[PDB]
Write a structure and sequence with these properties.
Largest sheet of chain A: 7 strands, parallel
Radius of gyration of chain A: 17 Å
Oligomer: homotetramer
Chains A, B, C, D: 3-oxoacyl-[acyl-carrier protein] reductase
Largest interface: A-B, 37 and 37 residues
PDB class: oxidoreductase
Entry title: Crystal structure of 3-ketoacyl-(acyl-carrier-protein) reductase (FabG)(Y155F) from Vibrio cholerae
Distance between the termini of chain A: 35 Å
Number of strands of chain A: 7
Bound molecules: NADP nicotinamide-adenine-dinucleotide phosphate
Strand order of the largest sheet of chain A: 3-2-1-4-5-6-7
Keywords: Vibrio cholerae, 3-ketoacyl-(acyl-carrier-protein) reductase, FabG, oxidoreductase, Structural Genomics, Center for Structural Genomics of Infectious Diseases, csgid
Number of helices of chain A: 7
Assembly: tetrameric
Chain lengths: ~220, ~220, ~220, ~220
């Protein structure tokens, strides 16, 4: 039906090889989007191509490298058209033990988690604003929420919305679980499909009047 | 049609459903398969709701300020349709406190015993459309978050949808219109269908891990 | 010195008989404010008068009652001048409960804030000078406090009045080894002291905080 | 009095030669801190020495250079003691480089503070006057991550986020002002007040926070 229909929309999903990212790309495809997901390797890309099938493809992308970003977007633009939906989900959620890390390892954690969001968002934004139509959904640092709301204010008048989905404890591959559960009023972990549901809602034409929002999907955790 | 955002088999009670935001909510819930009972203050209100719902539901007269009306309306619903699965509360200091805040609490409390026994329920409080406006919203939000914490573990979510400037009769002068619009980064009024979309998202099985949330549908306004 | 000096400022602190409220009132007085704290009873009021001494007094106030509010403010205005600083701290930190008990919890926790803030605001805005500081609960249902603060801040900013929230975490109040359970949630690894909530409030109440409004200042050991 | 008293505290304030940075260093000195401010040149350093007088001194520091950082800190440690308060003040390259200095300086002073169970790190965002959102987002992210990691050892890490402050950068004045609900620019002394509050013993239970000093702007 016409309800939450993404047919004719080109969606780029970063970090799409498993868990939350793969749920997002699959659901966006189920709702009619043409989906391009990314992984850090070619076998990651290929696996994304496998599960998307005719609904999209995978591409290898290093979020920290402006050359990779520029090439990946050219490839997308040539084959599919300008990006209409951008889901920034790439992140190395890798034991931030800041005090003990080397400066170059710390540069990489920041470029991957934060700077990449800015770079990707900036690159797709020109097209969306020219079109008067776009969705950027950021799924890293707590600076993400600030960046979302600042960018949302700036681009709202040109038909582009910018929103954050903030997950709680989601069941990924990563006992002492009962310890975690006690912090969640719903008393259970989230399913990655429930983050994807939120993202997909925000990506729809029906969410055109929601921008600058943080959608918490966390079992009541606040 | 599909299993996505499917409310088939769900009984929804929508208060204040005779026009605008309330009627958009009830219609969309019906489109997605819900059995919808909307309410108005009069029997001709009720009858007009019956008219537009058709086989997908009915209208009933309800005075939210009266515990006797509330108890009768729910008995009638329970007998004919089953227990309520989805409740949409849509409707100076005395006005705010007593009328709004108390009715919401009473209705929510009455449907909650069933939902918690079932381990399944949705309560969605819709704030009013943009002195005491900030106070009325503060109150609804405080009730949402307190009640969400208490019932989350028993499979019931409680959320607020906070509208900005939505196009209704009240908002329809030219000086004053263009004055309002300037405060909205999206540069246009909201459509009642967009408040309905948000409510229906929160009412779905897919939104099971969202509770205690305020979903602003306001073109970036706050 | 001239730094964080509240001399010549009339400060009304609700719920000032103990803990957070009394620390706020004492510190405001230390920094030169003329402080009126409130309790629900006259013996509450008298005890507040005792610990304030020459720096202020206690008055009986029921925050849920528009008559009590109007009387308490008249009494303050006549004797001290218009209120310059308002600390909304009153709150009963005590559900399938009866609906009238629930009405009371909301009127006392939230509606009172709106009523007191509104009452003192005419004077402050005429003066182009005022501080309203809402102190959130330490433990709920005050969650609307942050929204109200920000809406109200936007509206009155241009007339020289700031409106801010101080949001406490786990503070050591009157309040076993179920304590270690609480502590585990706090990255600083200890409870807050009521003097630390008071330090925050007094900062926000100073002339130096004139350009901060619409803020929530979390005093919670890193908790969120 | 004992209220907001920084006596016996050693404060390092980067970019301290003018505006916000100079207001921060002067206020910290007023409240009793022994203050070391920094500039990019030796004449910057000397001008900081001039206005601090007996309350501190200026040193030349290049924040982008690990050798300068290590030398400046040794010199400070030898003469004054470990740094108790650190105020980090004053497009892809600009963000990587500025964010990197903050991390390096903070990391260098942190070993001492955590051994002491006492420290304040206050990161001051740049003044509003696009990529600006990116630079702020980064400082805020670093603040909150680092704050979580060191909180248990008595150190707090906080951001002060200024709006439109009256400085040299700041007829289009009126254009800017319209965006500020308070209807006026901030004074650098008001950013300094905020920093000094966060640097006090009284703010020991505030960490991971962004304190906006912006006339209601957000
Ligand atoms: O609870 P609580 O928590 O035991 O008390 C905290 C503070 O709130 C005040 N308070 C409680 N209910 C109030 C009301 N209805 N009106 C005004 N102040 C109130 C108390 O005054 P008292 O301590 O004087 O009751 C006390 O200062």
């Amino acid at each position: 039906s016409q309800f939450m229909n993404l047919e004719g929309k080109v969606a780029l999903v970063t970090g799409a090889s498993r868990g939350i990212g793969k749920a997002i790309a699959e659901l966006l495809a189920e709702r009619g989007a043409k989906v391009i997901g990314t992984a850090t390797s070619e076998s990651g890309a290929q696996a994304i191509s496998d599960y998307l099938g005719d609904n999209g493809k995978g591409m290898a992308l290093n979020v920290t490298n402006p050359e990779s970003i520029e090439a990946v977007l050219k490839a997308i633009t040539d084959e599919f058209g300008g990006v209409d939906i951008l889901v920034n989900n790439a992140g190395i959620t890798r034991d931030n033990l800041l005090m003990r890390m080397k400066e170059e390892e710390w540069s990489d954690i920041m470029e991957t988690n934060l700077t990449s969001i800015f770079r990707l968002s900036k690159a797709v934004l020109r097209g969306m604003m020219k079109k008067r139509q776009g969705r950027i959904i950021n799924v890293a640092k707590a600076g993400v929420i600030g960046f979302t709301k600042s960018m949302a204010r700036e681009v709202a008048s040109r038909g582009v919305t910018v929103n954050t989905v903030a997950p709680g404890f989601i069941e990924t591959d990563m006992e002492q679980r009962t310890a975690t559960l006690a912090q969640v009023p719903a008393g259970r972990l989230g399913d990655p499909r429930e983050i994807a549901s939120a993202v997909a809602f925000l990506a729809s034409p029906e969410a055109a009047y929601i921008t600058g929002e943080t959608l918490h999907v966390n079992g009541g955790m606040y």
